[PDB]
Paper text:
To obtain structural insight into the full-length Rh-PDE, we determined the 3.5 Å resolution crystal structure of Rh-PDE–TMD with the linker region (TMD–Linker, residues 33–378). The TMD–Linker structure superimposes well on the TMD structure (RMSD value of 0.84 Å over all Cα atoms). While the crystal packing is different between the TMD and TMD–Linker structures, both form a similar dimer interface. In one protomer, the C-terminal residues are observed up to Trp353. Residues 311 to 332 adopts a straight α-helix continuous from TM7, while residues 333–353 adopt a short loop and α-helix, turning back to the TMD. In the other protomer, the C-terminal residues are observed up to His320 and also adopt a straight α-helix. In the dimer, the α-helices in the linker regions cross each other, suggesting that the PDE dimer is swapped between the TMD dimer. Although the crystal packing might affect the conformation of the linker region, we can interpret its structure and connectivity with the TMD. In this model, TM7 is connected to the PDE domain via the linker regions crossing each other, resulting in the swapped position between the TMD and PDE domain.
Enzyme rhodopsins comprise the N-terminal rhodopsin domain and C-terminal enzyme domain, connected by a linker, and function as light-activated enzymes. Rh-PDE derived from [name] (SrRh-PDE) was first identified and exhibits light-dependent hydrolytic activity for both of cAMP and cGMP, whereas it lacks pump or channel activity. SrRh-PDE consists of the long N-terminal region, transmembrane domain (TMD), including the rhodopsin domain, C-terminal PDE domain, and 76-residue linker region connecting the TMD and PDE domain. Here, we present crystal structures of SrRh-PDE–TMD with and without the linker region, at 3.5 and 2.6 Å resolutions, respectively.
Numbering used by the authors:
A (entry chain B): 44 to 353
B (entry chain A): 43 to 320
């Protein structure tokens, strides 16, 4: 329920990039390039997996900068503003993940890397996307910062659960998953309470589209805990798990933009509903000013119009 | 006379693009050599990953045009995104098949690299359609379009046949195809020009500004392929480098069109509710 202006979405956007331009430098300071080259060789397709995701996110932002300029309203404008920066961070993250010497941690389950840059992306992105849901539905400013902060610590636990021994990993990882359902349960009830046809303040998106948001987010964010579960269990390869993470990272953020584009293209029907009513009352005003009986000015006035409808 | 389309006509034109490609996919699985394809994806490990990534990029790019079709401003700006909804879908199933199927290919005489006929069979189905599609954004002669459409169809074929020829003739058949490429592009730049006139007889379904963008998007995005194969056959870049460029250039040329229809449809609604405020 922030109801922020375009200059606020710029101020939050420059904060995300400077709080990122600090994160990358932090992860470049602790770099061990001998092992980064060793990991980017033992797992060959990684530099291609992440480099392909960065290019895919480059066009993802271009689709938002078009939706931002050509936005139908100033309400839907500031919504594509947050997605413009959230998807831009996804591109500079995977660009650096695929070309830079970054900091990662050995995990206890299988000895795999923990990219931390991608975790540092989600802790910058995922809280913002829940604040984004706090505007498409206009929930309470507290009920949003609840799940917003609960989802930030959520990602942190699953990151700092890979280092832990067997049992404290299971218990910290299971603690993050329980918090996940909390975020997805409050959201489904956050949009569901905004979809009611009797709801002030009327949401900046149509009522039906909110169901698409609480559907797309639920069944796209669920992939990440499902991959970290299987891969730690040892039931899928590391790269096969990384490939899913890169595509799920794409479908989750891009899925919102295509819904924003869908909404901006749907107000055209709303325009064509207003055009109908205007031309209906316009023909109504003429009937309220004419007299329709035997007033012979062409034929009888009534049959002239009746022949027109015939 | 001129060049027009209709919704049900692009629907049957759409399903013709897929059945002439389904036939193509069968022929290339039929003549394929799986023992030789395994060697390709072995030496070039990133090939299978590139195509599968390109396919994912095109899967979403198709669905964006479906939203432009159901929520189109005009009956003509519908049958324009309709062509792209089939063009961009072929790219999704072409790259999904290139990354997951045993396909037929050829060894080029220049450097022994593979020549992906499935991709060549994609452009032969795409490029002549986008030029029929360019005959609807500008409404050129059905003869002026049939020329470039059949000249671009043989253009991609000549560049494919050039790989199998010896030294001397491959030079001239390749150069003979690039000479026709400029013939296609020169006719396009002047094809939008006739419609870009503020006093044109059949008003084009696009504004004058959006038409100059198209003749710039199609010039600067299509010129990459004749530069990739050039710098790859000469040996100035690795094969996988030219494939990654071909995997990105193939996305820009077709999503560049998809984002023009979005911005024009969006520019139309914002202009229309303004004309309602007044
Ligand atoms: C253990 C993983 C370590 C990774 C290594 C890099 C860490 C840097 C990442 C984030 C910095 C914190 C800045 C963002 C903090 C967001 C907290 C939050 O939830 O804010 C929501 C907001 O209240 C909605 O209105
Ligand atoms: C009716 C438009 C159909 C366009 C193609 C869709 C099917 C593409 C499949 C194979 C193309 C093989 C090469 C075909 C060469 C183009 C044929 C042509 O000249 O069409 C011009 C049309 O008359 C201008 O209105
Ligand atoms: C000026 C154009 C006026 C309007 C006409 C529109 C049509 C343009 C179409 C093709 C032009 C040539 C395509 C680009 C070919 C460049 C090849 C080249 O210059 O090669 C340099 C060399 O490869 C370095 O490494
Ligand atoms: C754009 C990136 C997004 C939306 C990432 C979302 C991640 C989640 C919704 C959940 C992640 C995890 C858990 C629920 C538990 C284990 C740790 C994670 C990060 C895999
Ligand atoms: C969607 C796919 C498109 C737009 C493909 C376009 C291909 C070209 C514009 C050109 C291709 C070639 C040449 C000009 C010369 C050598 C042969 C080709 C196919 C590389």
């Amino acid at each position: 329920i922030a109801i922020a202006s375009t200059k606020e979405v710029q101020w939050q956007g420059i904060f995300m990039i400077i709080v990122w331009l600090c994160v990358m430098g932090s992860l470049i300071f602790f770099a061990n390039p001998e092992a980064s080259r060793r990991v980017f060789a033992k797992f060959s397709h990684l530099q291609s997996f992440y480099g392909a995701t960065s290019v895919a996110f480059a066009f993802a932002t271009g689709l938002d900068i078009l939706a931002y300029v050509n936005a139908v309203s100033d309400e839907k404008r500031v919504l594509s503003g947050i997605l413009a920066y959230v998807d831009g961070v996804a591109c500079i993250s995977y660009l650096s993940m695929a070309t830079l010497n970054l900091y990662f941690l050995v995990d206890s389950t299988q000895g795999n890397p923990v990219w931390l840059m991608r975790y540092a992306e989600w802790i910058i992105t995922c809280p913002t996307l829940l604040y984004w849901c706090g505007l498409a539905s206009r929930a309470d400013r507290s009920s949003v910062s609840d799940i917003a902060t609960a989802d930030a610590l959520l990602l942190a636990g699953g990151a700092l659960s890979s280092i832990l021994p067997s049992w404290p990993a299971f218990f910290v990882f299971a603690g993050s998953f329980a918090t996940y359902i909390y975020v997805m349960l409050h959201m489904w009830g956050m949009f569901g309470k905004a979809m009611q046809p009797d709801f002030q303040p009327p949401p900046p998106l149509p009522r039906h589209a909110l169901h698409l948001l609480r559907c797309e987010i639920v069944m796209s964010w669920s992939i990440f805990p499902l991959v970290e579960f299987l891969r730690r269990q040892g039931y899928i390869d590391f790269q096969v798990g990384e490939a899913m993470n890169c595509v799920a990272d794409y479908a989750a953020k891009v899925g919102l933009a295509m819904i924003m584009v869908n909404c901006n293209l749907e107000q055209i029907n709303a325009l064509r509903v207003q055009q109908m009513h205007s031309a209906l009352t316009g023909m109504l005003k003429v009937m309220r000013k004419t007299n329709l009986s035997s007033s012979r000015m062409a034929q009888l006035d009534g049959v002239d119009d009746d022949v027109k409808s015939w």
